[PDB]
Amino acid sequence: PRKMYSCAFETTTKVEDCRVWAYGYMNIEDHSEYKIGNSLDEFMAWVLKVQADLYFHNLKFAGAFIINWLERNGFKWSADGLPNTYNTIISRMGQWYMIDICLGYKGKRKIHTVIYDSLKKLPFPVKKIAKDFKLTVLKGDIDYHKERPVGYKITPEEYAYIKNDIQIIAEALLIQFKQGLDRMTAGSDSLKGFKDIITTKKFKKVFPTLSLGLDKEVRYAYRGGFTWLNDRFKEKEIGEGMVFDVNSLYPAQMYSRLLPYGEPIVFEGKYVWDEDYPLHIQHIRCEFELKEGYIPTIQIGNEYLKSSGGEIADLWLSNVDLELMKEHYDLYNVEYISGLKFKATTGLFKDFIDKWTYIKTTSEGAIKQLAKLMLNSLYGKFASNPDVTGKVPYLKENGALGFRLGEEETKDPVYTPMGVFITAWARYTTITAAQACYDRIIYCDTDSIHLTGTEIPDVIKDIVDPKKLGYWAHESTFKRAKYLRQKTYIQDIYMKEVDGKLVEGSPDDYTDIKFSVKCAGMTDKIKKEVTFENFKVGFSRKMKPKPVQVPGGVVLVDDTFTIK
DNA sequence: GACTTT
DNA sequence: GGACT
DNA sequence: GGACTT
């Protein structure tokens, strides 16, 4: 069958002169077959002849260079696999999955080279993959901005970095493929594995294909994690506190919660209790005002709302979310419009989760990471959007890539109600624990609650455990902290030296402090600049790479990052 | 609701 | 915090 | 065909 290669480019960083200055490829099955060179023309000649499957890490980047070349070297876009054309899978939202370059046919053979994104398989930076998969990695980075003219001679040091980059991804992908995880994406692998375990026969019976109209209604109720900063603590210096984190939040909901299956039944007005269809999604219009003493749960944000402010809220809510809302808010002018009710059961994920949890628990390094990936990448596939209308590349007048929305396309839904309820139960888990600890609650993010003080609250003692699925682990304790916004905080965390290594400590048992920085969108280089003294709204650094399409490819231009 | 790449 | 060219 | 979320 087809050979597989791990590939990379190094590129120049001038908007007026953007080009590949190095390429590397390495056979994923035979890491001894590899080549590094300084010509995209040379690389692409190989691409056209190799009739293989190629992988770049973060194809959205390298892919720009490839398409720029194709468009200048006699290839046009086609969905239909015509000779001397290329097809793509680029989503509406700009996720890159595939470039398929068609040469035509020779004798019986379809001649093509397919290029995939290894980031879809291994959703971490290369450096993190090497660390977690226990693979050899060289310290440091290439000097990105060094002056490199056309034909620039690659140094031994640059060559070694490029070889290491492609070999890390080759090693990681080979391990993944040897486990049987050889579909296009981590989520696709997870879903296939789940079907293997429950059987396709059962899957089809219990997760029937919903009409596009019904799927759209269900999807209105699909929301993600609960992330919230208590205004009481916004931009304030905090003393001691502690963090609890659920042990495997989403798998825990899948393992034990009542979850929907089967063909829904539509109803008008307000849901009437049906023990046989005990879960529902309710379309409701209302105004609302948060009750004193309660955490807000309605996001229409980023922020969770205290009030509808005279704008009528038009919501589709799972019963889990609806009951939270009714408890946390006073509701006014309520109109129950319509909804959908579902059969439900526990246990649909037991065997899958048991299998991969065992592998996780009994394995190390690479295989352990893959078990985590299988467990973590399943729920999201249930709410896959049946609208798969994509984006088509083209060369703009200036010679840079532009993208147009392509032809309308739909596919079958998977089973969106399952996604709606998995995330609803996850939110319920976190919101209810935070609410129980209302007097001390600082911040929530998805599976974690942060409290003032250092003693475990009595009200959650019985649901705290360092390891047990779905319980809250006491993750850390801090000496001081500062929270500016959602996903934007720092902590001085108590640590202790054990066996010559630093691990989480406590106020009564610490040796040192770990200074921890969390800020969404902040790069690691910018994180190095942060201190307790300078961490405030208005903190700014012109150090955030932003991708710009230019003639030849993409330049990552350093842009201003500001805490707003 | 992306999350990485030079 | 906020990309989706 | 493929393709977690918008």
Side-chain angles (χ1 to χ4, degrees), chain A residues 181-225:
Chain A
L181 280 16
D182 61 12
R183 294 170 73 88
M184 192 180 310
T185 70
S188 190
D189 289 323
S190 282
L191 186 58
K192 183 271 193 180
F194 178 63
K195 292 182 178 173
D196 286 349
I197 293 304
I198 76 152
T199 77
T200 289
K201 182 174 181 66
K202 183 169 178 193
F203 190 100
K204 293 174 175 158
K205 188 168 186 167
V206 309
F207 304 124
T209 306
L210 299 199
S211 72
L212 294 173
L214 287 185
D215 191 73
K216 183 168 195 182
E217 296 189 352
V218 176
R219 180 174 307 285
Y220 297 136
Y222 188 51
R223 302 174 163 84

Side-chain angles (χ1 to χ4, degrees), chain A residues 190-191 193-198 247-257 259 346-362 368 370-379 382 418 422 467-470:
Chain A
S190 282
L191 186 58
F194 178 63
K195 292 182 178 173
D196 286 349
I197 293 304
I198 76 152
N247 298 312
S248 297
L249 179 77
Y250 287 114
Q253 309 318 302
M254 298 163 80
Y255 202 77
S256 71
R257 302 288 196 181
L259 298 168
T346 64
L348 286 161
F349 301 96
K350 181 170 159 56
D351 291 341
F352 177 83
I353 293 172
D354 285 349
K355 173 190 163 80
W356 288 103
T357 302
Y358 183 78
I359 292 167
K360 181 187 162 200
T361 297
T362 58
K368 183 177 189 167
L370 292 173
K372 294 163 65 182
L373 198 57
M374 287 291 287
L375 288 163
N376 288 334
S377 307
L378 184 54
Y379 85 84
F382 281 93
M418 184 59 87
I422 288 166
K467 326 184 215 308
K468 284 180 189 175
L469 181 63

Side-chain angles (χ1 to χ4, degrees), chain A residues 100-125:
Chain A
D100 191 359
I101 302 163
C102 179
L103 286 300
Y105 297 88
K106 294 192 192 191
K108 308 185 190 301
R109 323 305 193 194
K110 161 69 170 159
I111 311 306
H112 75 301
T113 293
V114 192
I115 311 181
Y116 295 114
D117 190 8
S118 52
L119 189 61
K120 298 287 181 294
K121 293 255 55 173
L122 299 163
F124 319 93

